Tab-separated table of C-alpha atoms and ligand atoms in Angstrom:
chain	number	residue	atom	x	y	z
Z	1	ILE	CA	47.513	61.831	-35.454
Z	2	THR	CA	43.821	60.930	-35.503
Z	3	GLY	CA	42.898	57.786	-33.590
Z	4	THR	CA	41.577	56.482	-30.311
Z	5	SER	CA	43.019	57.065	-26.850
Z	6	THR	CA	44.517	53.991	-25.279
Z	7	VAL	CA	46.716	53.130	-22.329
Z	8	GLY	CA	50.067	51.438	-22.808
Z	9	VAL	CA	52.510	49.987	-20.281
Z	10	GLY	CA	56.297	50.055	-20.127
Z	11	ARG	CA	59.504	50.597	-18.141
Z	12	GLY	CA	61.414	53.850	-17.732
Z	13	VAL	CA	65.111	54.558	-17.722
Z	14	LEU	CA	65.450	53.434	-14.076
Z	15	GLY	CA	63.600	50.184	-14.778
Z	16	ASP	CA	60.343	51.247	-13.155
Z	17	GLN	CA	56.992	50.137	-14.572
Z	18	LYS	CA	54.442	52.817	-15.466
Z	19	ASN	CA	51.311	53.268	-17.559
Z	20	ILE	CA	51.352	55.749	-20.411
Z	21	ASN	CA	48.675	57.433	-22.462
Z	22	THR	CA	48.902	56.429	-26.143
Z	23	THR	CA	46.882	56.736	-29.366
Z	24	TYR	CA	45.967	53.832	-31.628
Z	25	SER	CA	45.902	54.103	-35.430
Z	26	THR	CA	47.410	50.936	-36.893
Z	27	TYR	CA	50.318	51.480	-34.493
Z	28	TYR	CA	50.237	52.756	-30.941
Z	29	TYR	CA	51.757	56.224	-30.680
Z	30	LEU	CA	53.188	58.165	-27.785
Z	31	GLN	CA	50.380	60.719	-28.051
Z	32	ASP	CA	48.534	61.488	-24.806
Z	33	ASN	CA	45.139	62.982	-25.592
Z	34	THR	CA	44.177	63.379	-21.925
Z	35	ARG	CA	46.181	66.548	-21.290
Z	36	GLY	CA	45.525	69.802	-23.116
Z	37	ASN	CA	46.029	69.643	-26.869
Z	38	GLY	CA	48.206	66.577	-26.397
Z	39	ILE	CA	51.601	65.356	-25.289
Z	40	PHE	CA	53.646	63.948	-28.169
Z	41	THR	CA	56.942	62.058	-28.036
Z	42	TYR	CA	59.300	61.411	-30.916
Z	43	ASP	CA	62.313	59.320	-31.894
Z	44	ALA	CA	65.324	61.298	-33.080
Z	45	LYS	CA	67.075	57.967	-33.902
Z	46	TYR	CA	70.543	59.092	-32.783
Z	47	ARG	CA	70.514	62.080	-35.131
Z	48	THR	CA	70.016	65.810	-34.636
Z	49	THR	CA	67.189	66.470	-37.044
Z	50	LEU	CA	64.083	67.445	-35.065
Z	51	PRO	CA	61.653	66.491	-34.069
Z	52	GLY	CA	62.172	63.157	-35.758
Z	53	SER	CA	59.278	60.712	-36.062
Z	54	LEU	CA	56.275	60.407	-33.727
Z	55	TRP	CA	56.932	57.361	-31.571
Z	56	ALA	CA	55.117	54.297	-32.935
Z	57	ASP	CA	54.982	50.870	-31.312
Z	58	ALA	CA	53.245	47.791	-32.618
Z	59	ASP	CA	51.798	46.360	-29.401
Z	60	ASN	CA	51.468	49.190	-26.897
Z	61	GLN	CA	54.080	47.563	-24.665
Z	62	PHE	CA	57.231	49.580	-24.078
Z	63	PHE	CA	59.708	47.407	-22.253
Z	64	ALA	CA	62.599	47.443	-24.718
Z	65	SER	CA	65.785	49.193	-23.624
Z	66	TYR	CA	65.376	51.553	-26.630
Z	67	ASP	CA	61.871	52.392	-25.355
Z	68	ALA	CA	62.787	53.517	-21.853
Z	69	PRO	CA	63.816	57.137	-22.552
Z	70	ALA	CA	60.590	57.683	-24.578
Z	71	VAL	CA	58.514	56.229	-21.777
Z	72	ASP	CA	59.923	58.657	-19.260
Z	73	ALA	CA	59.915	61.731	-21.481
Z	74	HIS	CA	56.254	61.112	-22.184
Z	75	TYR	CA	55.292	60.216	-18.622
Z	76	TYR	CA	57.195	63.028	-16.922
Z	77	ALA	CA	55.856	65.591	-19.353
Z	78	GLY	CA	52.422	64.517	-18.103
Z	79	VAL	CA	53.476	64.810	-14.477
Z	80	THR	CA	54.853	68.275	-15.132
Z	81	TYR	CA	51.586	69.191	-16.953
Z	82	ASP	CA	49.676	67.969	-13.933
Z	83	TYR	CA	51.843	69.971	-11.552
Z	84	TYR	CA	51.235	73.256	-13.327
Z	85	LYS	CA	47.527	72.643	-13.852
Z	86	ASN	CA	46.663	71.361	-10.398
Z	87	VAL	CA	48.982	73.567	-8.405
Z	88	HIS	CA	49.114	76.805	-10.347
Z	89	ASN	CA	46.044	76.584	-12.558
Z	90	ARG	CA	48.276	76.911	-15.605
Z	91	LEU	CA	47.301	74.965	-18.740
Z	92	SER	CA	50.503	73.778	-20.390
Z	93	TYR	CA	53.485	76.039	-20.895
Z	94	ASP	CA	51.754	78.834	-22.805
Z	95	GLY	CA	48.738	78.847	-20.457
Z	96	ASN	CA	46.549	77.827	-23.391
Z	97	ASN	CA	47.168	74.061	-23.540
Z	98	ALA	CA	49.860	74.103	-26.194
Z	99	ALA	CA	50.901	70.648	-27.308
Z	100	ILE	CA	53.948	69.403	-25.461
Z	101	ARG	CA	56.387	67.742	-27.833
Z	102	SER	CA	59.572	65.872	-26.905
Z	103	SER	CA	62.276	64.031	-28.810
Z	104	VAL	CA	64.522	61.305	-27.323
Z	105	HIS	CA	67.591	59.437	-28.652
Z	106	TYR	CA	68.992	62.807	-29.700
Z	107	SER	CA	72.450	62.497	-31.216
Z	108	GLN	CA	75.058	60.035	-29.874
Z	109	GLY	CA	76.391	60.001	-26.320
Z	110	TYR	CA	74.772	63.399	-25.832
Z	111	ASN	CA	75.177	64.534	-22.221
Z	112	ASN	CA	72.367	67.058	-22.071
Z	113	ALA	CA	68.671	67.890	-22.512
Z	114	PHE	CA	67.124	71.194	-23.566
Z	115	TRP	CA	64.141	73.182	-24.678
Z	116	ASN	CA	64.873	74.496	-28.171
Z	117	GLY	CA	62.158	77.174	-28.365
Z	118	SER	CA	59.528	74.745	-29.568
Z	119	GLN	CA	60.067	71.355	-27.917
Z	120	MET	CA	61.974	69.171	-25.489
Z	121	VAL	CA	65.118	67.364	-26.630
Z	122	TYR	CA	66.884	64.599	-24.724
Z	123	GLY	CA	70.256	62.957	-25.202
Z	124	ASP	CA	70.933	59.391	-24.006
Z	125	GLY	CA	74.143	60.395	-22.207
Z	126	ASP	CA	77.449	58.681	-22.823
Z	127	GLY	CA	76.602	56.235	-20.046
Z	128	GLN	CA	79.396	57.500	-17.831
Z	129	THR	CA	78.536	61.113	-17.085
Z	130	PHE	CA	74.886	60.499	-17.901
Z	131	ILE	CA	72.248	57.877	-18.677
Z	132	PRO	CA	69.200	59.025	-20.775
Z	133	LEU	CA	68.340	62.364	-19.362
Z	134	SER	CA	64.554	61.950	-19.497
Z	135	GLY	CA	65.112	59.546	-16.577
Z	136	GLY	CA	65.262	62.571	-14.292
Z	137	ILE	CA	61.920	64.165	-13.499
Z	138	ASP	CA	63.716	67.273	-12.276
Z	139	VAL	CA	65.521	67.476	-15.623
Z	140	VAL	CA	62.258	67.107	-17.500
Z	141	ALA	CA	60.487	69.724	-15.397
Z	142	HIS	CA	63.495	72.100	-15.349
Z	143	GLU	CA	63.522	72.145	-19.131
Z	144	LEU	CA	59.733	72.372	-19.497
Z	145	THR	CA	59.890	75.286	-17.047
Z	146	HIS	CA	62.089	77.173	-19.520
Z	147	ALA	CA	59.081	77.124	-21.909
Z	148	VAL	CA	56.937	78.583	-19.136
Z	149	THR	CA	59.481	81.332	-18.500
Z	150	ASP	CA	59.824	82.073	-22.236
Z	151	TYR	CA	56.058	82.664	-22.408
Z	152	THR	CA	55.931	84.743	-19.182
Z	153	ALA	CA	58.823	86.976	-17.888
Z	154	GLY	CA	60.987	86.031	-20.882
Z	155	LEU	CA	64.212	86.349	-18.902
Z	156	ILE	CA	67.122	86.833	-21.322
Z	157	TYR	CA	69.553	83.907	-21.146
Z	158	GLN	CA	72.637	85.775	-20.011
Z	159	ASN	CA	74.090	87.346	-16.891
Z	160	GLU	CA	71.712	87.890	-13.929
Z	161	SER	CA	68.429	87.535	-15.802
Z	162	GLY	CA	69.836	84.331	-17.253
Z	163	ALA	CA	70.788	82.960	-13.834
Z	164	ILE	CA	67.293	83.781	-12.562
Z	165	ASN	CA	65.993	81.931	-15.579
Z	166	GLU	CA	68.115	78.920	-14.606
Z	167	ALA	CA	67.106	79.111	-10.924
Z	168	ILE	CA	63.435	79.308	-11.776
Z	169	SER	CA	63.846	76.075	-13.715
Z	170	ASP	CA	65.707	74.361	-10.845
Z	171	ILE	CA	63.080	75.548	-8.359
Z	172	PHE	CA	60.066	74.236	-10.254
Z	173	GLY	CA	62.045	71.249	-11.413
Z	174	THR	CA	62.549	70.388	-7.735
Z	175	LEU	CA	58.937	71.172	-6.791
Z	176	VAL	CA	57.720	68.819	-9.521
Z	177	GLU	CA	60.102	66.200	-8.109
Z	178	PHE	CA	58.567	66.661	-4.688
Z	179	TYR	CA	55.117	66.723	-6.244
Z	180	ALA	CA	55.671	63.293	-7.700
Z	181	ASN	CA	57.118	62.300	-4.341
Z	182	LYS	CA	59.733	59.857	-5.604
Z	183	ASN	CA	62.971	60.199	-3.680
Z	184	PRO	CA	62.687	63.989	-3.648
Z	185	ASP	CA	65.689	66.170	-2.819
Z	186	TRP	CA	67.143	69.647	-3.425
Z	187	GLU	CA	69.787	68.455	-5.874
Z	188	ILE	CA	69.479	68.526	-9.655
Z	189	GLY	CA	69.902	65.586	-12.044
Z	190	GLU	CA	70.916	62.991	-9.429
Z	191	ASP	CA	68.723	60.267	-11.002
Z	192	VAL	CA	70.579	60.256	-14.325
Z	193	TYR	CA	74.015	61.566	-13.347
Z	194	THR	CA	77.168	59.433	-13.054
Z	195	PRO	CA	75.669	55.963	-12.629
Z	196	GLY	CA	79.003	54.833	-11.184
Z	197	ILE	CA	78.991	57.327	-8.282
Z	198	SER	CA	76.310	57.590	-5.626
Z	199	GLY	CA	75.250	60.752	-3.843
Z	200	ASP	CA	76.252	63.315	-6.476
Z	201	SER	CA	74.427	65.556	-8.945
Z	202	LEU	CA	74.891	68.475	-11.359
Z	203	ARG	CA	73.885	71.069	-8.779
Z	204	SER	CA	72.709	71.569	-5.262
Z	205	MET	CA	70.181	74.213	-4.186
Z	206	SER	CA	70.690	73.684	-0.445
Z	207	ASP	CA	74.524	74.040	-0.778
Z	208	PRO	CA	75.500	75.217	-4.253
Z	209	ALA	CA	79.086	75.286	-3.063
Z	210	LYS	CA	79.135	71.464	-3.050
Z	211	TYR	CA	79.685	71.718	-6.822
Z	212	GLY	CA	81.589	75.017	-7.007
Z	213	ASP	CA	78.586	77.318	-7.337
Z	214	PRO	CA	78.188	80.564	-5.440
Z	215	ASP	CA	75.854	80.774	-2.450
Z	216	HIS	CA	76.317	84.521	-1.926
Z	217	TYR	CA	76.197	87.581	-4.205
Z	218	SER	CA	79.678	88.703	-3.298
Z	219	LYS	CA	80.893	85.339	-4.653
Z	220	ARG	CA	79.125	85.729	-7.982
Z	221	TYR	CA	80.836	84.885	-11.235
Z	222	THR	CA	81.342	87.898	-13.499
Z	223	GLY	CA	83.245	86.476	-16.492
Z	224	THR	CA	81.862	85.653	-19.943
Z	225	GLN	CA	81.729	81.847	-19.930
Z	226	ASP	CA	78.391	80.039	-19.568
Z	227	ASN	CA	76.645	83.146	-20.972
Z	228	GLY	CA	77.919	85.124	-17.994
Z	229	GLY	CA	77.513	82.276	-15.478
Z	230	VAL	CA	73.825	81.411	-15.819
Z	231	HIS	CA	74.326	77.879	-14.420
Z	232	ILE	CA	76.769	79.213	-11.831
Z	233	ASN	CA	75.132	82.309	-10.394
Z	234	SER	CA	71.863	80.391	-10.295
Z	235	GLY	CA	73.278	79.034	-7.027
Z	236	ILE	CA	72.648	82.340	-5.281
Z	237	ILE	CA	68.967	82.329	-6.145
Z	238	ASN	CA	68.586	78.567	-5.594
Z	239	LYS	CA	70.084	79.070	-2.170
Z	240	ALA	CA	67.588	81.813	-1.390
Z	241	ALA	CA	64.720	79.634	-2.602
Z	242	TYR	CA	65.879	76.735	-0.434
Z	243	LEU	CA	66.106	79.010	2.589
Z	244	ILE	CA	62.631	80.437	2.020
Z	245	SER	CA	61.226	76.904	1.918
Z	246	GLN	CA	63.280	74.952	4.420
Z	247	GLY	CA	64.882	77.733	6.419
Z	248	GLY	CA	68.275	77.914	8.066
Z	249	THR	CA	71.157	80.206	8.993
Z	250	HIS	CA	73.523	81.191	6.195
Z	251	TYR	CA	76.490	83.457	6.832
Z	252	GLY	CA	74.894	84.352	10.151
Z	253	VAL	CA	71.517	85.307	8.697
Z	254	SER	CA	68.578	83.301	10.009
Z	255	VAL	CA	65.695	82.366	7.697
Z	256	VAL	CA	62.420	80.872	8.909
Z	257	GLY	CA	61.172	78.325	6.380
Z	258	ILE	CA	57.649	78.702	5.041
Z	259	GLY	CA	57.493	75.432	3.098
Z	260	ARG	CA	57.559	74.356	-0.545
Z	261	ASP	CA	53.989	75.175	-1.525
Z	262	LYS	CA	54.335	78.815	-0.475
Z	263	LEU	CA	57.792	79.037	-2.128
Z	264	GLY	CA	56.089	77.699	-5.226
Z	265	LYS	CA	53.204	80.149	-5.025
Z	266	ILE	CA	55.448	83.132	-4.418
Z	267	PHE	CA	57.843	82.326	-7.251
Z	268	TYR	CA	55.051	81.394	-9.683
Z	269	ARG	CA	53.392	84.761	-9.026
Z	270	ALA	CA	56.704	86.588	-9.380
Z	271	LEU	CA	57.489	84.830	-12.630
Z	272	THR	CA	54.057	85.459	-14.128
Z	273	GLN	CA	53.259	88.938	-12.857
Z	274	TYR	CA	56.357	90.939	-11.997
Z	275	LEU	CA	59.502	89.687	-13.688
Z	276	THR	CA	60.627	91.004	-17.084
Z	277	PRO	CA	63.208	89.978	-19.720
Z	278	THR	CA	65.983	92.030	-18.116
Z	279	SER	CA	65.236	91.575	-14.419
Z	280	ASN	CA	68.314	91.466	-12.223
Z	281	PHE	CA	68.734	89.787	-8.830
Z	282	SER	CA	67.697	92.871	-6.871
Z	283	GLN	CA	64.638	93.073	-9.079
Z	284	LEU	CA	63.882	89.424	-8.387
Z	285	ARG	CA	63.950	90.159	-4.649
Z	286	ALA	CA	61.425	92.973	-5.018
Z	287	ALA	CA	59.194	90.827	-7.224
Z	288	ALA	CA	59.376	88.075	-4.621
Z	289	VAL	CA	58.564	90.398	-1.726
Z	290	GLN	CA	55.742	91.925	-3.707
Z	291	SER	CA	54.397	88.488	-4.589
Z	292	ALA	CA	54.462	87.297	-0.964
Z	293	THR	CA	52.754	90.527	0.051
Z	294	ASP	CA	49.975	89.926	-2.475
Z	295	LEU	CA	49.473	86.395	-1.247
Z	296	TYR	CA	49.986	86.676	2.503
Z	297	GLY	CA	50.032	90.366	3.478
Z	298	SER	CA	52.715	92.934	4.266
Z	299	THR	CA	53.055	91.671	7.866
Z	300	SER	CA	53.164	87.985	7.108
Z	301	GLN	CA	55.909	85.638	8.205
Z	302	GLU	CA	56.117	84.819	4.504
Z	303	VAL	CA	57.144	88.308	3.502
Z	304	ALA	CA	59.689	88.368	6.337
Z	305	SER	CA	61.170	85.054	5.322
Z	306	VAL	CA	61.584	86.185	1.751
Z	307	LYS	CA	63.556	89.259	2.854
Z	308	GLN	CA	65.681	87.186	5.237
Z	309	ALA	CA	66.450	84.720	2.481
Z	310	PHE	CA	67.701	87.344	0.070
Z	311	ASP	CA	69.548	89.114	2.855
Z	312	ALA	CA	71.289	85.829	3.592
Z	313	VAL	CA	72.591	85.535	0.022
Z	314	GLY	CA	73.683	89.181	-0.172
Z	315	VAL	CA	70.944	90.320	-2.533
Z	316	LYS	CA	69.348	93.627	-1.682
X	401	LIG	CA1	56.273	47.306	-28.111
X	402	LIG	CA1	65.643	62.744	-6.232
X	403	LIG	CA1	66.523	66.188	-7.688
X	404	LIG	CA1	75.637	59.544	-9.708
X	405	LIG	ZN1	68.193	75.225	-17.828
């Protein structure tokens, strides 16, 4: 909408106070004019018609319980925007400052969030398995990263290219988490998962096996469920990514960690310059080695660490 940029205040899903960029025109809308061609957040009002209505508030204060998922979807989209712009010089998900649109209050007791080709969509959870999913910055950035992938490599959402697609989202989801520096970890979804149980999550990058996911190629899932295991076999790549960043010894193979920023630069370069819609795991390894070469040189520690990491997860 047309109006004037203002700054509202509210509380997110976890009860934390934050400022948000809004737009005034009779009401105050969740429309952030400070990033690209705008960040826009919508109310799906418990239904599944999208995007729903642009979020409007009478007083620019967003402390109602119903407000909290909107507050975080809006805020964490901006954090994710900032990550990609400041760290990777990428302007929004298409690289040309496309408007980032999100809808919250999607459906009833909906235990999931997703990018639907055009926008972000967040359920409120059923309150047992999940609370509103926009509460999790890694969830927000994971899903926004699918838009980035769709506009770059375009990894098909099935089998190995699909699992790479998933891993890429968990990797940058995690790096955004660290970027914001609020209780960062290498697990996914912990902030909005099972409010009655502490210490768990949907997935773990550092030990995928903690939630039944493979951490080696020889353990990969090869059935037809989950589009050929995209959220399962992602563990193998996530493991490799963890090892490149933090290092360790996995099934006897030692990896010297190079840190998150370099992991981020190598995988960003791989995603945007070498990967393709049908890339398999072995092709990901080569893209990663080639990217670290570009960035650090053939003889760098960095290149060596990348090869060690993929060796460690059985990917040649
Ligand atoms: Ca209000
Ligand atoms: Ca965390
Ligand atoms: Ca996390
Ligand atoms: Ca939990
Ligand atoms: Zn995903």
